[PDB]
């Protein structure tokens, strides 16, 4: 990461510029000069042909320009893993998002065929049911392959990160040995920091991409849902209601769980104090006096019981939200089902879109499980390097 403070900001600026240019006259101009049409299939054959090929070439060109600029600006030893590797990881995350989009689109003809078959016995021959599956596997195999490669590259990428700073910490071992706990900060926290930061970045980018990809799909599906259950007709009611429900659930979870990270941090503090007293009592006789250990464990008891009490409220909120969201997608479609505006395929596609968007909003809350750990690890590493 050459100059990370400038590096990440320049990466975001370049990403915004490229997105603005592509989602403008340039995106259509490339197709016009190339001969591409918006006739993207539903099988796996959409992951090639000019509509996707032009985007692959555009991504390659833009990433190449960015990499050339950062290679000439300030060369770095791990420039082929931090600049090109991160670009590859982002591209593969986008590709997996698009595979999910393709499967969601395939859910409509399949369930339309299922409804047709169930309407009257022996109206749909079984061969027509194999071909549809013969389509899905065609997509699925790709999601089987790329993902397996992705989990490979990411892993190696992560390890390279560990190597990088481990090529630096151990290069300053003589002037950094005196710090307390340097062994753990060089061996243990290195993997933890690298893996946690990479996973959180990937999850955040994946959530953003899922939202960006599944908002147009839900907007184009809202032409078949002209009336919401209780509030009546609302323009773009389906997408508005889905967004409001998802952000309301996320906000409810992130408001009932503001004190959870603080209680967790208090738990680590009291556990660390307990372990420190035990360590002092290790090679001693006057330490670990039963009064002292009793008081320390009473503190541990109280600080765990407080967290166990607050997590009850948080768990009430989370479980209720999940149980309601299990049927909110169909609740929003009930008037369309009654009035016969959507079919089985459209209903299943809308439910799938709702689930994927809910996962996209849920990534932010799920990152809070180890956000405390990542912040603690970064604080430890910053204090460790600062004394140098």
């Amino acid at each position, epitope marked *: 990461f050459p100059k990370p403070g400038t590096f990440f900001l320049s990466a975001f600026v370049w990403a915004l510029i490229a997105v603005i240019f592509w989602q403008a006259g340039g995106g259509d101009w490339v197709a016009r000069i190339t001969g591409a049409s918006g006739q993207i299939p539903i099988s796996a054959a959409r992951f090639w042909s000019l509509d996707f090929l032009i985007f692959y070439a555009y991504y390659i060109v833009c990433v190449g320009l960015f990499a050339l600029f950062w290679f000439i600006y300030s060369p770095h030893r791990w420039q082929y893993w931090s600049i090109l590797g991160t670009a590859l990881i982002i591209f593969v995350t986008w590709f997996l998002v698009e595979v999910g989009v393709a499967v969601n689109a395939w859910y409509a003809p399949f369930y339309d065929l299922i409804q047709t078959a169930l309407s009257s016995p022996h109206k749909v021959t079984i061969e027509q049911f194999y071909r549809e599956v013969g389509v899905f596997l065609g997509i699925a195999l790709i999601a089987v392959v790329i993902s397996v490669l992705n989990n490979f590259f990411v892993s190696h990428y992560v390890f390279r990160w560990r190597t990088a700073m481990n090529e630096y910490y151990m290069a300053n071992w003589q002037q950094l040995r005196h710090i307390e706990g340097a062994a753990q900060r060089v061996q243990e926290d290195t993997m933890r920091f690298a893996s946690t930061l990479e996973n959180m970045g990937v999850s955040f980018i994946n959530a953003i991409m899922t939202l960006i990809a599944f908002l147009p799909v839900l907007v184009t599906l809202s*032409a*078949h849902v*002209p*009336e919401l259950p209780i509030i*009546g*007709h609302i*323009p773009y009611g389906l997408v508005i209601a889905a967004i409001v429900w998802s952000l309301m659930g996320t906000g409810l979870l992130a408001v009932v769980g503001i004190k959870l990270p603080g209680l967790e941090f208090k738990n680590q503090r009291v556990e660390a104090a307990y372990r420190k007293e035990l360590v002092y009592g290790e090679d001693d006789a006057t330490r670990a006096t039963p009064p002292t250990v009793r008081e320390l464990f009473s503190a541990v008891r109280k600080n765990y019981f407080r967290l166990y009490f607050h997590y009850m409220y948080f768990n009430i909120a989370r479980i209720l939200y999940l149980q309601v969201d299990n049927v909110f997608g169909l609740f929003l479609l009930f008037p369309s089902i009654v*009035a*016969g*505006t959507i079919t089985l395929g459209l209903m299943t596609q809308i439910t799938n879109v709702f689930g994927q968007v809910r996962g996209a909003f849920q990534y932010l809350i799920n990152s809070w499980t180890t956000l405390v750990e990542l912040m603690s690890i970064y604080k430890r590493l910053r204090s460790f390097e600062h004394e140098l």
Partner: nanobody, 114 residues
Framework: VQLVESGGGLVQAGGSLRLSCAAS????????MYWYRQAPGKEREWVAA????????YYADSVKGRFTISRDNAKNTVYLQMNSLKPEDTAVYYC????????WGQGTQVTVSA
């Protein structure tokens, strides 16, 4: 509300027609008007829907881009202008509202011959 639909007739293939749903009972300004069709010897199908104001119109996936539904909330009517009539677009067209209960109108027989 009694929906009286008078737009029926015999139209050759590749023509145009206009259908009306002149209401007579309770004023329908705060309601979404629905236009259904029933094919000969088949089930009723959704064709179009229009909001309270003639701004947001929703069309079936098979008649999208050809049929055009609009409102005339000074005469309490919803109009369906249907053009580029395929030979498969022969049916009995019904107009539907929901004012407390479901209100269906007498259908108009739209026939197209290839």
């Amino acid at each position: 509300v009694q929906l009286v639909e008078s737009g029926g007739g015999l139209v050759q293939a590749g023509g145009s027609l206009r259908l009306s749903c002149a209401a007579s009972g309770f004023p329908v300004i705060a309601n979404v008007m629905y236009w259904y069709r029933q094919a000969p010897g088949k089930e009723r199908e959704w064709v179009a829907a229009i909001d309270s104001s003639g701004e947001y119109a929703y069309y079936a996936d098979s008649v999208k881009g050809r049929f055009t539904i609009s409102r005339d909330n000074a005469k309490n009517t919803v109009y369906l202008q249907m053009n580029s009539l395929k030979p498969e677009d022969t049916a009995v067209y019904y107009c539907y509202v929901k004012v407390g209960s479901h209100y269906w109108g007498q259908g108009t027989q739209v026939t197209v011959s290839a």
